[model samples]
Target: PLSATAALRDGAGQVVGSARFVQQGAGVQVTVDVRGLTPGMHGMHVHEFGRCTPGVDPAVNKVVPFGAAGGHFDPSMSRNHDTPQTDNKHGHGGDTPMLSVGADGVGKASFTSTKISLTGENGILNRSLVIHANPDDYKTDPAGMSGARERCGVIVRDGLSVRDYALPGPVDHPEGVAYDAKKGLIYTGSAQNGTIYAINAQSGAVTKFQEGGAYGRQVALGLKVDPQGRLWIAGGAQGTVSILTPDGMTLAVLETPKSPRPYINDLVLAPDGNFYVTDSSRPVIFRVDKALKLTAWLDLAGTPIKYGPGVNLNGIAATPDGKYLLAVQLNTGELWRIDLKTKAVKKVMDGLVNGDGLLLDGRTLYVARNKDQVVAKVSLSADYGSGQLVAQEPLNGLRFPATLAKVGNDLVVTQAQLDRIGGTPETPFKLTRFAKF
Candidate 1:
């Protein structure tokens, strides 16, 4: 097992506490012992970037202790600020339970994270471990309402292991992203070459997972990995959904022959062992059952609406309970909820133009507004009858993020770089992770 230690220090470089990390069964166990601190709970986490410079950041023109450590260490880019748990899905990869320093001015705690590793994807080697001044309110984004960085230190192996890290290079134009929790890998499809890539989660390494095919010129607009380790790929202009093995070998291809405008956009699998796909060019949804039989699940051929270019259903998602399905219209900018048992469709909200990917977390729906360069978090009622826009988090730095996925407590988005759709490429395509709203 690999082991590391940290001498948490204040701005003056004086040690106030110590931390130890050891690779255990399936996770890294962390133990922290701190003293000479204020009483009550404090926020502690592993931060992105290794250097802990308690000085001014020239880029921001501000001075904050340990600010150079950057945000949380989130390799999956699941921009969530929550208390850490054994399962990575509960919070950001760097998150951990609050550290409580009692009245005696001493704090001691132990935690574990399966999301962090010593050597592979989600690795913490070389990153900084930080202790905040105040308690973590837990509900806030980015830093969980954690106060100033009181003590910080870099994570280093006992002797020395991987010392350097480099983010993988850009892709042609990525549309969809899927994470294999069992294998600890991330996969995305290239809209430029119709190729699929497998990414090492801990080390930012990329490998060609599958080659582009003749039929998949506009390949992998939407990709998902089912519970059984099967990958479901929605070929954008091919009018097909291909099923493949974990290793990227084709198993079967489900086609939509009746679709006149077969632009398969996004897909989500329900808890009842069925898949739902959206047709971006038509008013219909395709369903694939457990037996692999494909059919048009819902056809709103003549829905009351004003027709215009790029006016169609795009993002789709299934409620965690599997009782309802939610979708967003790209141009019309409307949100719809469909009852699974009765096949009833109802409009929940509107005013979300350029909405691309839809993700449902509990009763809240997160929609990626690609053109607007923002992610809107909508709150839905218990019965899915109505929803209200609660938050609109702007993502101006990313090139044109099209889709989003929830990994651990964070959200991962795909940078489709569609602004270069009809023009020359201006920037290399990459994925951007958000830490706050």
Candidate 2:
């Protein structure tokens, strides 16, 4: 069976304990190995948080080591302090047997519990596994006199992880994100002021890539890289599209044809070596030829899509076989497929409200539902018309995610606080990483 693991670290940040948990029958087989600890019986339990950072424990209203882990994990809200053997009426899933360290300052123990499992449901993943300074009495109202926290670690699902990288500043509501596979960098730009920032995919380093606003640019919505490694940045509300060399020199900034109000939201590079752009303000699709010529390709006024009251046709992606272009109408909650050759628009699927970004892998489509705070996965038919929703995973720690980018097997998303933009936003901003999920 695939087991879950966590590395327990002491106050000094040294890993002194190791924990392994696996599902065996109906019970979970828990194995904890320890070193460099005090000799005696020590309390052991799972905490409510995945964090090991020290902070004030609300229980004592004072600083406690690893307090950020909060209290014991009680998904059922059992409220009863239980043990690994016998539990309360509702039961506390966090409770485990006491840890006994020998005079040599090392220990190991194994047991099985029906109170918890290794799966995502009712599991300990994304929570802290803690060793206490004292032994648990196993019968108290709260934590059973488990003195102070000695060591702690977060348990994560195998092959999956989460990380949040801080941006440099307010960044004027950084919205769009693009990935450079060769250089391993993610590009983001302000939706309000049009400044661009480059993020190191591996190290999470944020640096200024280019400047805007002062250069006659207003909003930067969609940033994409073509086969030539050149950057194509879309200007939202300004009806402009700029192309830059791989090294960052601007080749040209072409102003796209406008309707009443043109909000160039997102774009995709097709197999035919051309870029297709979507405008949310109006039901219009703009195309830039392989030779960098702008043309008003398709207007949705005569098509199946109804143009905006607000933000229709938000995210766009081209199918793998180069047969059609897929886009989502955020307000209508509809998926549209457009024939590249005939420019025919057809409604394929519905119920993808606030769909902000579209990532197509073969027939597997990933849609970022902006206001819903979740990303949806759908496996589609070869015809790109029908599909089954695989899952809808929540986007935690991110506020109003605008778009998505894939690096390796991981997802890099922009936590663009559009809901609270022009107001106080979380300082430094952030890029949420769903690693290998």
Candidate 3:
């Protein structure tokens, strides 16, 4: 029998609360209990390490122990979750579904370790427990989008105890982030003021790189870096596509050609070095080439996109092989798989609600479950396919996490602050990094 404490981490690595874990049951039925939780459906899980370190930091680190310990419970030895390597073709034993709490800020769950047992002499998940800020998408590569390691604790000699640490700077409303490979930094885009800033990947110190949208009147939506090393901006309210030079100077601003409605929803770069824009408010898709020649084209639209309902395009991505153009609808839980060769569109996945950001990495596709507040993923075994819910986290804690990007070894995402902005300085947005080793 053991006791446990806990902590919570938002996407921005900020600790929001503190708690612990408790050990129950006997022998093979031994149970790990996470106690003192605030309430609600708290996303909880047993992370990959036996040591959450001593800092009381929710950033679980088995190696650093304090810099977010547990490193990821990769029992299969997978380098990343979406594309498991040859040795780790399947998910490890430690990868389980997300844990949910009740309205009382308390949740109960029991687990027996096949690879992560506790009573036996050795186990994989003996070192720590991870309490996510929200729920886990279950399908999200690696650990789902459980925010940060909100809270963590070590599986001790006899019991689980709580540790406390200093909380980092408060990041109220964090949105999406873009990785600058050439500069080795992560840049963030703010929706309120239309300002873009850079953070040292190593130290977390922020530097205001550039000011977009004159007088901070624009609503900056998405920030992405293309294959050719250019920064792309999707300013929603501004209804424009802004390109930033490598030196942080404005290269050009192309007014997005309006559809029956207006709004620059999202942007993606094609194999030919052009861009595909999805304007949702007007529910239209457009393509722009290198010469800045914009064309209003609908590669895939007008079908049973959502059981014959009209279409709303939000998240967009090109297949890894660059053969298909995939987009997800925010309002309708549907996926549009456009065959570039045939220019035909097919609904791949449906029955989802509030599907936000979409990413095609390796053999799986990740979709942000905006309402459920979790990032979902599906394994693509064939050309047109559906996936499983690998994991899920909380959306309220996520605020408005809207975009997903694979940068080097980490998966950086954004939070739009749809709920936590304006009223207070508590901008409910954030950018969380989901990594697997």
Candidate 4:
């Protein structure tokens, strides 16, 4: 079983608890041996990276570096677990399903990693395991939304006596995701609370950003760094837009214009300096200017707009050349291209099923199929009509794939906790990274 070097605490670095894990196959069927853990169900999974330094909560201190075990393992594909095809996007290779603990303070389970190649003479077993403080809401879509971290352990190579942390249960939601870019800190989102956090982006240190909403109702829908170096936040439930200054000092939160339905799904800043937002469920595309102006609000109409036969818009992307706008409808499977100057809606592609997140690079566009559970990179320019299938991964072993962001040269995709509706371990929730197309 994975061992703990010190006690564990929330964010104060106070070691209040402890736990461990054991490996099974290429998939680490983990077991947490919570000797003194509080009696109850808890969330658990393999976090990205951390050094097992033997000290007071060294794991929390995180004596590791960036890209060590590597960012969320993603082979590049679909999003969410509703689909069982084991393709990209839907779910990635590395996702900790669910774990349940009783009065005994122990749990166990087995999981697989698609991003890691464990072939002849190939190995990548330095990842760590985490146990949350609550149960996992294993919905059918993204990673089941589990609670907080109660314990953690690093998966080692050797004996597979597995079965310990608590019990292998089912969860269908995406647990929270923790990040600390500067010190390799890890920040995790809360399944029960609607909030965004910045743990040791590199080390596991925790700093949280609270958003308004009822417990478990609010989601950190979209997060991105603007060209000016500010952190942009999209509040799904609160229907608001916020900006965290580059210095991380000032916070600007603004409410969306009151409408019949006001759920701000995602936002992207264009070269022209206008922030384009995807207002899903409804067929409106809103543009918030540099001055936070509630400018152009376009309603969906024909062909492409006709795309959302009844589905809601989920994904948003702007062409690198700044000539076109790409949007996806989650309910209806369709893609649309809006003319920037003419303010015209053009149907570029269709037949995608449920489009979730979008990423456009010049001629090719990466579309994450929500219901279908796969990703497709289609080429534009009128010839193909739809798009080319650059690469695809089914959402079988993988979980729900939600948001997709371009980090440097890699595409970072997120699987929200929509998979854990049934129970614990949620289906497949993870952040996948793929090479730039």
Best by lDDT: 2
Residue 98 miss distance in model 4 (angstroms): 25
Q: Residues 1-437, candidate 2: write the lDDT tens digits.
A: 54677898999899888898777864678889989889999999988677898877867799878988878877566878877765534667788888889999996889887776654335566677999988899888678888889989887655545787777765567788888899888888888788778888888888878777644356788889776777788888788888767777778888876557778889999888889999888777899998889888997889878865778998999987889999999988889999999989888888888888888888888888767666788788889887777776653434567788887888878878786776655455777788523
lDDT of 4 by residue, 10-91 (tens): 3333444443332244332233344445666555544444333322222345433221332233334233432212443555
Off by over 4 Å in 2: 1-159, 435-437
Worst 10 residues of 1 by lDDT: 160-169
TM-score comparison, 2 vs 3, better candidate? 2
Rank ordering of all candidates by lDDT, starting from the highest = 2, 1, 3, 4
Positional deviation of residue 313's Cα in model 1 after best superposition, in angstroms: 0.6
What is the C-alpha local distance difference test score of each model?
Answer: 0.76, 0.80, 0.57, 0.49
Task: For model 4, state the Cα shift of residue 196 in Å.
Answer: 1.5
Q: Which sections of candidate 4 miss by over 4 Å? A: 1-192, 199-218, 247-250, 301-311, 382-386, 394-397, 419-429
Q: Note the clash tally of each candidate.
A: 8, 0, 58, 111
What TM-score does structure 2 among the candidates reach? 0.67
Angstrom error of the Cα, residue 4, model 1: value is 34
Q: Number of the top candidate by TM-score?
A: 2
lDDT of 1 by residue, 1-437 (tens): 56878788888988888888888964789999988888988998888656678655434568889988887877556777776763455567888778889899998999877877664446676678999987887668878778788889887657532211122434467888887888877778877667877876667677878777655434778889899878788887788898878977888878897547678888999988899998888777899999999898877764443335884788889988889999898898988888889787788889888888888888988888876656788989998889999876543223466887765566677867675665543234566554423
The RMSD of every model to the true structure, in order and in angstroms, is 14.0, 7.3, 14.3, 13.7
Least accurate stretch of 10 residues (summed lDDT) in model 4? 160-169
- Listed in order, each prediction's TM-score against the native is 0.61, 0.67, 0.60, 0.54
lDDT of 1: 0.76
